[PDB]
Amino acid sequence: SVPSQKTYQGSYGFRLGFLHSGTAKSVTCTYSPALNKMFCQLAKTCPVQLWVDSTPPPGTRVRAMAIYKQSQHMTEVVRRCPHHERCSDSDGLAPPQHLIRVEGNLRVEYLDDRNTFRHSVVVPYEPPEVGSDCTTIHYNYMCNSSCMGGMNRRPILTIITLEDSSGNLLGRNSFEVRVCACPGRDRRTEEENLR
Amino acid sequence: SSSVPSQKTYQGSYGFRLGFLHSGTAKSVTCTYSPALNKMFCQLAKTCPVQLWVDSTPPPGTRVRAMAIYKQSQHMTEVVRRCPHHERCSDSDGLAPPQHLIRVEGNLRVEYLDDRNTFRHSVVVPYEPPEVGSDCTTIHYNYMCNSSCMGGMNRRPILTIITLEDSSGNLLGRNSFEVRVCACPGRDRRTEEENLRK
Amino acid sequence: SVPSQKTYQGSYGFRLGFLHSGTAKSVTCTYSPALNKMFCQLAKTCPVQLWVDSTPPPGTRVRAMAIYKQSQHMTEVVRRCPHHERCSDSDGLAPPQHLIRVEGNLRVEYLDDRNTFRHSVVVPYEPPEVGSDCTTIHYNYMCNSSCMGGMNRRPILTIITLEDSSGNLLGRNSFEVRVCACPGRDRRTEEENLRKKG
Amino acid sequence: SSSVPSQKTYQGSYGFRLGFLHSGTAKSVTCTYSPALNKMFCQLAKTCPVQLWVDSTPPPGTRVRAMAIYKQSQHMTEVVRRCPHHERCSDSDGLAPPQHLIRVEGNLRVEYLDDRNTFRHSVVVPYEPPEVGSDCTTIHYNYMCNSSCMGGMNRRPILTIITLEDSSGNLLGRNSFEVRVCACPGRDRRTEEENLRK
DNA sequence: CGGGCATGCCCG
DNA sequence: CGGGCATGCCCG
DNA sequence: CGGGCATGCCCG
DNA sequence: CGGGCATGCCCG
Ligand SMILES: [Zn+2]
Ligand SMILES: [Zn+2]
Ligand SMILES: [Zn+2]
Ligand SMILES: [Zn+2]
């Protein structure tokens, strides 16, 4: 199977936002709007903002899941490589096999889907803090796109889904990710190549 | 890695809550509480008064335990302990094991627990009701490393969890607060308060 | 942990020889006499000649084992990285964790030493072909020097020993190995680096 | 307390002296030397190249030793060692004792000593003559605590004493220089040199 | 690396 | 924060 | 192959 | 970080 990637802003006008951090060679996380693509370093903080037109109900949850972008790879589960799965860099909460973690949220929940075997990470939705217009989740990606026996230089998309407390769809957005050593260098390269 | 202690306020059947003095924000005040942040700022080894306020009186045998945990969910499963330097300074008061971060001062009935399963440290004293003409019981805590101590807290923020417990360790009430141990509590309190809006 | 790497011709005058090869950028296997170092691609045939002054007894065996060259890594067992171990690329005889295999020899034995945990591969010694001067063994190396989780960019030596049928040592020689994508380029580079010493 | 090695610079009969790299004062330069102060400023664990210059070649078996002492008369008898945090960090190069402040890198012949009488730490290497095309021999030192380290140097300045010694440890030559290990060597050298002037 | 600050001390 | 500095380090 | 790039990572 | 290079892989 393949999880849906279709954008769905939904009744709450769900949108993503990203920080605008530029293309210095080793910027930790930066986002290319031309490419709708986050470029980020392994294990570093990757902020993703949730913007809504109105507040979803209490019990609302926010899930992230990686899939391969290329059609020929889409049915293959995205996992960490054999090396990084064994590095023992757990924060005590995340399963060692999961590519995507959330940092700074003790209510984080990881799922290994019993039917599709896909990995995902979910947290409760919380409204923006006073004086803030969005809710920010800190994600970490735990292998480079280049990892042999893992993503193996294949691009991924992250799919962010807003769900009710039972798992019903409320909203969906997505972005491509490249996890790399020098996000600024690589962003500039793919955009210049775009031009 | 260690399972994570709850930090949720639980007044329980004795209406248990905390109180803190009003000490101001002079640059190097020894201890000061920020109601806005629910955060104590204090100097290493200096007296940190924490008031226990109840509605009904807990039965004799009730104990009051304090434990530190890392605030950041990503360090929360790691035991909070003193740094290698201060563990070796010989500044024990006669009862506190040297690796323990939190001490209680002035109480001969104090006990220190190095837990067998979780390895977490805690310090416990019998609950005593307030003096006649007092509305609360005050415990004097000390924190024996700076938040900045390398190889200890290592600039990571902590929470202190205060639990009311029965003589067997069962939960009766709980409250918590963040703590920064630092050189200039008044200065840092002001900085962090200013950060709320910046 | 570390087996001796000390060159020992022993009573049979045991030496290693190596085929002439170029430094064509991606030549499959090339030996640098200057460096005493083989440069080869992953899973490619690597010829190693065995030379003796006198014939060892029947039942003699030829063993090959990799160790890290650098002294701070010497006690760590050289093995294949987690990815390559799991690639199901075995020849049918080599256990998948073994770095060094022998090609074209059904009398090969692979040993995972129960005491030292080191891997080695052994074949019976067969004297040179009638007329010929040496015996050639074909080795393969199943990870790049670069493999993360495996050699991780650290230089190794291959130690070749002649042993009697009970495992008593008769002779010993060695050579450095880099397993890499472009053995010709890299031999060229390392030889250029040499000349700049100084 | 420990008796105090001489720091008195003298070239002796082989004309022994040190050269430093004049790397300027960029804020975070890894290592830099002030001639006006005779003082090296360097970051923790970074390469500190020290050149050995001689007018004539010393004999086979000549060695070169480095040792730190406190510069301040009131602290001179105290052994200089790493702080408890850094001693316990996972930063070994597989050779240096974890308590030793000064290491040499890039040399398997390095030897570390705790003095039988003074318990003072030193690091020693064989003297090698300059490489072809060079007029000096360069040693790469590393300093493994900051001058500021609590429980270690604790903001007290040190000298490093470099001695040229015969194979028996008799002194052939000596040169000393002040060291500050710090996060911003260029900043702090520029500051200290500013502070010379009226 | 290093601007801008975090965070120690008062013979800092 | 009382003013002034010594002195470490995140993240671009 | 030889030329050149993708992409991790060390130096200051 | 920016400069450079290690080191896999691809292109024509
Ligand atoms: Zn990986
Ligand atoms: Zn401490
Ligand atoms: Zn491999
Ligand atoms: Zn130190």
mmCIF file of C-alpha atoms (C1' of nucleotides) in Angstrom, chain D residues 148 155 183 187, chain F residues 6-9:
data_model
loop_
_atom_site.group_PDB
_atom_site.id
_atom_site.type_symbol
_atom_site.label_atom_id
_atom_site.label_comp_id
_atom_site.label_asym_id
_atom_site.label_seq_id
_atom_site.Cartn_x
_atom_site.Cartn_y
_atom_site.Cartn_z
ATOM 1 C CA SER D 148 39.452 28.010 33.702
ATOM 2 C CA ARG D 155 41.892 30.067 36.400
ATOM 3 C CA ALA D 183 37.786 29.068 24.107
ATOM 4 C CA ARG D 187 40.476 37.413 21.631
ATOM 5 C "C1'" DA F 6 36.353 36.963 32.466
ATOM 6 C "C1'" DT F 7 35.486 33.548 29.795
ATOM 7 C "C1'" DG F 8 32.596 29.626 27.815
ATOM 8 C "C1'" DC F 9 29.786 28.023 23.551
#
